[PDB]
Design a protein around this motif. Structure first.
Motif, PDB file in Angstrom:
ATOM      1  N   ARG A  53      24.108 116.120  68.614  1.00  0.00           N
ATOM      2  CA  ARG A  53      24.867 116.809  67.571  1.00  0.00           C
ATOM      3  C   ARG A  53      24.365 116.437  66.182  1.00  0.00           C
ATOM      4  N   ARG A  54      24.068 115.151  65.964  1.00  0.00           N
ATOM      5  CA  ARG A  54      23.524 114.737  64.670  1.00  0.00           C
ATOM      6  C   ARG A  54      22.160 115.372  64.403  1.00  0.00           C
ATOM      7  N   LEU A  55      21.306 115.440  65.430  1.00  0.00           N
ATOM      8  CA  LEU A  55      19.999 116.078  65.269  1.00  0.00           C
ATOM      9  C   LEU A  55      20.133 117.564  64.951  1.00  0.00           C
ATOM     10  N   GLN A  56      21.074 118.242  65.613  1.00  0.00           N
ATOM     11  CA  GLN A  56      21.300 119.659  65.353  1.00  0.00           C
ATOM     12  C   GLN A  56      21.803 119.889  63.933  1.00  0.00           C
ATOM     13  N   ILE A  57      22.673 119.002  63.441  1.00  0.00           N
ATOM     14  CA  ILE A  57      23.152 119.102  62.063  1.00  0.00           C
ATOM     15  C   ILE A  57      21.998 118.929  61.080  1.00  0.00           C
ATOM     16  N   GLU A  58      21.095 117.983  61.364  1.00  0.00           N
ATOM     17  CA  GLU A  58      19.931 117.781  60.499  1.00  0.00           C
ATOM     18  C   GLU A  58      19.033 119.016  60.461  1.00  0.00           C
ATOM     19  N   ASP A  59      18.786 119.630  61.620  1.00  0.00           N
ATOM     20  CA  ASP A  59      17.957 120.836  61.656  1.00  0.00           C
ATOM     21  C   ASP A  59      18.629 121.993  60.917  1.00  0.00           C
ATOM     22  N   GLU A  61      20.735 121.773  58.365  1.00  0.00           N
ATOM     23  CA  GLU A  61      20.642 121.576  56.921  1.00  0.00           C
ATOM     24  C   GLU A  61      19.207 121.744  56.425  1.00  0.00           C
ATOM     25  N   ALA A  62      18.215 121.522  57.294  1.00  0.00           N
ATOM     26  CA  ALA A  62      16.843 121.884  56.942  1.00  0.00           C
ATOM     27  C   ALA A  62      16.702 123.391  56.743  1.00  0.00           C
ATOM     28  N   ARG A  63      17.318 124.182  57.628  1.00  0.00           N
ATOM     29  CA  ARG A  63      17.303 125.636  57.438  1.00  0.00           C
ATOM     30  C   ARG A  63      18.057 126.043  56.175  1.00  0.00           C
ATOM     31  N   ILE A  64      19.151 125.341  55.870  1.00  0.00           N
ATOM     32  CA  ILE A  64      19.909 125.602  54.646  1.00  0.00           C
ATOM     33  C   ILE A  64      19.036 125.373  53.418  1.00  0.00           C
ATOM     34  N   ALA A  65      18.235 124.307  53.435  1.00  0.00           N
ATOM     35  CA  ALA A  65      17.314 124.059  52.329  1.00  0.00           C
ATOM     36  C   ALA A  65      16.219 125.118  52.259  1.00  0.00           C
ATOM     37  N   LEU A  66      15.766 125.623  53.408  1.00  0.00           N
ATOM     38  CA  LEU A  66      14.663 126.581  53.402  1.00  0.00           C
ATOM     39  C   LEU A  66      15.088 128.029  53.177  1.00  0.00           C
TER      40      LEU A  66
END
Lengths: 70, 54
Positions: A53-59, A61-66
């Motif tokens: 779940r933490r890894l999915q949240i990180e990915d 927020e990476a899409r949110i930045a991109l």
């Protein structure tokens, strides 16, 4: 004379009874083993699922930045 | 072999399996027990063979 006869003392013992040794554990032992295996699996799954779940949240927020450049 | 016996079946000792329900399971168990008692009679005949003619 020479014939087919048993010896003087007879032959050895010959079995004719059912032999089931009853090998195994009691029900409490196998049920406790199953419960312990279930608890170990549940604990490992809880740890790995929290990490996933933490890894999915990180990915995400990476899409949110991109997002805005795209 | 127990009620109307013949030649030397009265000189051996063996048990007779008895069913309880009449199903195929009880009769299969009776056949297996008859195999056991046949082994018993075979041992008794091996240990008690008399000499003589044929």
């Amino acid at each position: 004379v020479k014939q087919d006869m048993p010896p003087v003392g007879g032959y050895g013992p010959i079995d004719y009874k059912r032999n089931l040794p009853r090998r195994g554990l009691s029900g409490y032992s196998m049920f406790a083993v199953g419960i312990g295996a279930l608890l170990f699996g549940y604990w490992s799954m809880m740890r790995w699922n929290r990490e996933r779940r933490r890894l999915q949240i990180e990915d995400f927020e990476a899409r949110i930045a991109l997002m805005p450049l795209l | 072999r127990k009620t109307q016996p013949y030649d030397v079946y009265d000189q051996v000792e063996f048990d007779v399996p008895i069913g309880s329900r009449g199903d195929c399971y009880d009769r299969y168990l009776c056949r297996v027990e008859e195999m056991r008692q046949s082994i018993r009679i075979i041992s008794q005949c091996l240990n008690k063979m008399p000499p003589g003619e044929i």
